[PDB]
Design a binder for this molecule. Structure first.
Ligand SMILES: CCn1c(CO)nn(-c2cc3c(C(C)C)cn(-c4c(F)cccc4Cl)c(=O)c3cc2F)c1=O
Ligand SMILES: Cc1cc2nc3c(=O)[nH]c(=O)nc-3n(C[C@H](O)[C@H](O)[C@H](O)COP(=O)(O)O)c2cc1C
Ligand SMILES: O=C(O)c1cc(=O)[nH]c(=O)[nH]1
Length: 354
């Protein structure tokens, strides 16, 4: 009824109007500004959405994926939007501009975006001071089941990938509930992740974040088997499955389908779910998975949960549906959980594998 009306209006009228008036990067920039200022209305989270994972309570399992709030400017407005957790970044050590504009492209016919931002970042030091300003506010949020993740990048020109990520661990690890490293042979991955975990383990017990590895959906079977093996061997805390795809699934209609970059949204959905499914099996259900890629409904959310995800993220659906999508996904997920006989989200995790 009321929520649905709001959802209708945003999906059918407001967002298409606003996206038609703006270039896509301007739209992103304006969203971050509006969100930072809390210019949003406000769905009471039931107990059945609560998840305990990664050393933390999550009030609900629907997170904002990396890339929306690259520089940690809008964290409080994102909780206000109703996300159960927030992931900022990617943040690189040094400030960098990222790629030339235009670098974001809408494929509205496909409910997809292509981006090639190229890790535009304010840098660790700006983001550190920004999180420091609200550090105690975040400690209370985390305690109340609303944790904060930080995705760490590397500078375009850097010689030593591992040292960039290490810098990130040292600077932002003390302010994060979890840290994320994106990965694109096996001995080099082990070397990199060893160094990351060593740095993490050197932070004082109360400032010690979980470390997650975030994979694209474009990896070979050999890459996925090697990642599962290294993740288990090293005691990596979790996996974020997946980033955008450099593939172009047959059937894209948008005029901008041949733009270089990462494809997100609906055409990534089932690629992403199947990657969750394979990573869950290769890790024997022992490594918590955050599912991401084309979530715009409770059904999308539940398919990833049942495939092996403990938590989900979305970004692209926000570009088409606006802020009401968060309440929509949560409400539909709750209803689906009851319809399939699950007492809560926890019971559904990996339910397809059993
Ligand atoms: C991929 C880059 N990218 C694109 C282009 O593909 N769009 N986009 C978003 C834009 C918006 C906008 C724009 C249209 C002004 C407003 N609002 C919003 C709000 F922030 C506060 C109260 C009302 C509204 Cl509608 C959103 O939530 C929102 C979210 C997005 F992800 C975004 O990150
Ligand atoms: C504009 C844009 C910027 C992104 N930036 C980042 C980033 O800096 N780091 C990262 O790990 N993922 C980034 N992502 C990937 C998302 O976090 C997510 O994995 C992907 O978009 C799939 O989810 P979706 O289909 O819900 O958007 C970005 C995605 C988009 C669309
Ligand atoms: O900044 C970007 O280009 C970017 C980073 C990332 O991890 N994923 C993505 O789709 N874009």
């Amino acid at each position: 009824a009321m929520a649905t009306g709001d959802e209708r209006f945003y999906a059918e009228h407001l967002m298409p109007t606003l996206q038609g008036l703006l270039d896509p990067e301007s739209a992103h920039r304006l969203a971050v500004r509006f969100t930072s200022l809390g210019l949003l209305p406000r769905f009471q989270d039931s107990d059945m959405l609560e998840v305990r994972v990664l050393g933390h309570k999550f009030r609900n399992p629907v997170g904002i994926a990396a890339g929306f709030d690259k520089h940690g400017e809008a964290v409080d407005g994102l909780y206000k939007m109703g996300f159960g957790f927030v992931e900022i970044g990617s943040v690189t050590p040094k400030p960098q501009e990222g790629n030339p504009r235009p670098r974001v492209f809408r494929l509205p016919e496909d409910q997809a975006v292509i981006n090639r931002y190229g890790f535009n970042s304010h840098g660790l030091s700006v983001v550190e001071h920004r999180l420091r300003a609200r550090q105690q506010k975040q400690a209370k949020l985390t305690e109340d089941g609303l944790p904060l993740g930080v995705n760490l990048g590397k500078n375009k020109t850097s010689v030593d990938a591992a040292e960039d990520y290490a810098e990130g661990v040292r600077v932002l690890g003390p302010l994060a509930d979890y840290l994320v490293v994106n990965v694109s042979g096996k001995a080099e991955l082990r070397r990199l992740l060893t160094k990351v975990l060593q740095e993490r383990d050197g932070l004082r017990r109360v400032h010690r974040p979980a470390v997650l590895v975030k994979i694209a959906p474009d990896l070979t079977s050999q890459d996925k088997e090697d990642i599962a093996s290294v993740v288990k061997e090293l005691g990596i805390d979790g996996l974020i499955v997946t980033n955008t795809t450099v593939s172009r699934p047959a059937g894209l209609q948008g005029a901008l389908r041949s733009e270089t970059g990462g494809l997100s949204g609906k055409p990534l959905r089932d690629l992403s779910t199947q990657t969750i499914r394979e990573m869950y099996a290769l890790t024997q259900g022992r490594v918590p998975i955050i599912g991401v890629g084309g979530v715009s409904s409770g059904q999308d959310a539940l398919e990833k949960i049942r495939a092996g995800a403990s938590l989900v993220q979305l970004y692209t659906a926000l570009t088409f549906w606006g802020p009401p999508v968060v309440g929509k996904v949560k409400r539909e997920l709750e209803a689906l959980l009851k319809e399939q006989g699950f007492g809560g989200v926890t019971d559904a995790i990996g339910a397809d594998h059993r």
